[PDB]
Amino acid sequence: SKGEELFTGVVPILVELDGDVNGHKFSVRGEGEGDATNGKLTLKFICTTGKLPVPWPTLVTTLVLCFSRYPDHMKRHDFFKSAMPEGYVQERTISFKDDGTYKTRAEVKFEGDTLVNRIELKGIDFKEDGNILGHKLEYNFNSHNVYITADKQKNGIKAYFKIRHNVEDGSVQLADHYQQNTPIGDGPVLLPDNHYLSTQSVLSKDPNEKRDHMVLLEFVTAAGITHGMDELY
Amino acid sequence: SSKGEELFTGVVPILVELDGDVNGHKFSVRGEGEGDATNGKLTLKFICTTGKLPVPWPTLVTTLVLCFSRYPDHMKRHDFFKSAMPEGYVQERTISFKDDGTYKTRAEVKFEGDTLVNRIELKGIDFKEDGNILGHKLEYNFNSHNVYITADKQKNGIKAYFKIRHNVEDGSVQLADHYQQNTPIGDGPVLLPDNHYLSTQSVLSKDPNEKRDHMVLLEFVTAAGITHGMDELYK
Ligand SMILES: [Cl-]
């Protein structure tokens, strides 16, 4: 795609999220940069409305898969970069086991030289003293796989994965992610064969930042394409 | 699928000790940190305990614990590195810097109590006086790579090959070919794998509180390249 050429260097990123969970509103703004050749992202997020009413780890997946490292042999299967520069809509339902649900809608696109992710998030049916609204999640993150398949009828993709959030008592809070992406433009996009992305995330704090915030390093790498060749062999 | 796998289900402390000699320039490095194999994650800080490193930090990354790789459930029977524990394995490499010299390394990786220890000797020869390595012309960063692995039935271990791409300060790339062998230290049985690869990603940084010559490293290593029937069914 012509879109993949936009990612050959380090690209600045802007993230803007407006959220409402059980009526608790908040906004998050993030900035940083992405290096898709190595599949690497670094960002700092601030809650601009004061205190975040949910744990930061619950927002990581919502807060730019166009920065995934796609191996040379799998370039034809990178939908995210192929939709650029006009971009794509990413929508999810995230179901927290035994608790509430987030519904998200994001637009990911270039504005000038910057890759912007603008998100609206609505959360409902959370327990006021559950793991989420009770802030019982550890400030850390696990490695996951994002499973991707084409959705020809929407000219896009679907994905599924299950996030594991460590809870302060030693338990694990599961969050099922149901995802769809569709291009914003009408130009042609690449629809992939089935594959997955391996993800790793590291969360930290800036010691000179007084606002409620999260520093994030993330790696995302594509794998799992069965070429006819090795299916033969 | 091995007993050794059980030693890696949580966070394991790591100690790394390296003695090096590159064209007669001697040095030592000590590293400490921890590994979380469930997530394929390593966090370490290394100090050059002899003062200044005579080679670029990036050239030592690969030498300075693949037992911390995340193997997917369906590939756990191919995890040689964990299966050799706790007695451990010897890891040897020849690393050829294209158009420059060579490192030869020998390391023992094993548990000493609750700590996973990597103790290494490195000898470097034939480096060019004008070159990217002794000239310190390499950027302080690292790229993502694939480590290719195959069984070595004759030595009851494995062999590996990969090509590291080091960014050079003028925009070129300095290649480093890695040839690797691993063999178990103990007698116990080990898992000999089908061909596969490890996908690696690394971030180099500095600790603002540390005034010694040092490198902070975060790394992710995940096994791949062996498919499973449920994934293939729907392709
Ligand atoms: Cl250096």
Other Cβ atoms closer than 10 A to A47: 21
Q: What is the C-alpha separation between A71 and B140, in angstroms, rounded?
A: 23
CA dihedral for B98, B103, B104, B106, sign (positive or negative): negative
**Beta-carbon neighbour count of residue A191 at 10 Å?**
16
Q: What angle do CA A70, A71, A76 make, to 5 degrees?
A: 70
SS3 of residue B133 by DSSP = coil
Q: How many CB atoms lie within 10 A of CB B73?
A: 8
Q: Which domain holds residue A208?
A: 1-233
Task: Return d(Cα B153, Cα B192) in angstroms, integer.
Answer: 7
Q: Six-digit token pair at B164?
A: 């590291």
Contacts 24+ apart (CB under 8 A), B202-208: B202/B61, B202/B142, B202/B143, B202/B144, B203/A40, B203/A217, B203/B142, B204/B57, B204/B58, B204/B61, B204/B140, B204/B141, B204/B142, B207/B45
What protein residues have CB closer than 5 angstroms to ion ligand 1? B 56-57
Which residues lie closer than 8 Å to A171 by C-beta, 6 or more apart? none
Dihedral in degrees, nearest 10, Cα atoms B32, A207, B210, B168: 90
Half-sphere exposure of residue A125: CA atoms within 13 angstroms, side-chain side? 10
> Do the chains contact at A200 and B40, CB–CB below 8 Å?
yes
Length of chain A: 233
DSSP letters, A154-188, are GTEEEEEEEEEEEBTTS-EEEEEEEEEEEESSSS-
Task: List helix spans (H) across chain B.
Answer: 80-83, 229-233
Residue B66 has phi, psi (to 5 degrees) of -75, -5
Q: What is the DSSP code (8-state) at residue A1?
A: -
Is the distance from CB of B64 to CB of B225 less than 8 angstroms? no
Pull the structure tokens for residue A178: 């149901």
Q: Are A164 and A86 in contact (CB under 8 A)?
A: no
CB neighbour list of residue A180: distance below 8 Å, 6 or more residues apart: A90, A91, A92, A151, A154, A156, A157, A158, A159
Instruction: Decide: A182 and A154 in contact? Cβ < 8 Å.
Output: yes
Among candidates B105, B86, B110, which has minimal Cα distance to B18? B105
Cα gap B88→B117, rounded to integer Å: 9
Strand partners, A215: A44, A204
How many beta-carbon pairs below 8 A join chains A and B? 59
Cβ-proximal residues to B3 (8 Å cutoff; 6+ apart), any chain: B83
CA distance B9 to chain A (A): 13
Spatial distance between the Cα atoms of A101 and A22, rounded to a whole number of angstroms: 10
- Residue pair A47/A205 in contact (Cβ under 8 Å)? The answer is no
Strands (E), A48-87: none
Q: Which amino acid is at A39?
A: G
Residue A55 burial by Cβ neighbours in a 10 Å radius (0-12, 13-18, 19+):
buried
**Smallest CA–CA separation between B126 and chain A, in Å?**
31
CATH number of the structural domain spanning residue A129: 2.40.155.10
Which residue in B199, B234, B235 is closest to A221 by CB distance? B199
For residues A135, A136, A142, A145, the Cα torsion angle rounded to the nearest 10 degrees is -70
Residues in chain A with CB shorter than 8 Å from the CB of B220 are 143, 200, 219
Q: A200: which chain B residues are within 8 Å (Cβ-Cβ)? A: 39-41, 201, 220, 222
Contact partners, residue A164, CB within 8 Å, separation at least 6: A142, A144, A172, A173, A174, A175
User: Contact, A216 vs A202, CB < 8 A?
Assistant: yes
Chain B: which residues have CB within 8 Å of chain A? 38-41, 70, 72, 143-144, 199, 201, 203, 218, 220, 222, 224-225, 227, 231-232, 234-235
Q: How far is A38 from chain B (nearest CA, A)?
A: 5
Q: Say if residues B84 and B62 touch (Cβ distance below 8 Å).
A: no
Nearest to B70 among A37, A40, A143 (CB): A143
| Contacts with A178 (C-beta within 8 Å, 6 or more apart), sequence order | A92, A93, A94, A95, A158, A160
Note whether B144 contacts A224, CB cutoff 8 Å. Answer: no
Smallest CA–CA separation between A145 and chain B, in Å?
10
Count of domains forming chain B: 1
CA distances from B50 to A40, A116, A126, B29, B125 (A): 33, 46, 56, 8, 20
Structure tokens at B207: 């600790």
Nearest Cα to Cα of residue B13 among B40, B33, B41, B39: B33
- The two three-digit tokens of residue A233, written as one number: 């062999």
Query: After what residue numbers is chain B broken, C–N > 2.5 angstroms?
Result: 64
Is residue B202 within 8 Å of residue B140, measured between CB atoms? no
Let me know: does A66 contact A37? Beta carbons within 8 Å.
no
User: Do residue B203 and residue A193 have CB atoms under 8 angstroms apart?
Assistant: no
State whether A226 and B227 contact (CB < 8 Å). yes
Distance CA B152, CA A57 (A): 43
- Give the dihedral of Cα atoms A32, A33, A34, A35; nearest 10 deg: -140
Report CB contact under 8 Å: B232, A226: yes
Residues of B in contact with A142 (CB under 8 A): 38-39
How many whole angstroms from B175 Cα to the centroid of ligand 1? 16
Strands A40-47 and A213-223 turn out to be antiparallel
Distance of CA A169 to the CA centre of its chain: 26
Cα distance between residue A83 and residue A79, in whole Å: 6
CA distances from B143 to A182, A194, A200, B166, B222 (A): 31, 26, 16, 7, 15
Amino acid, single-letter form, for residue B72: P
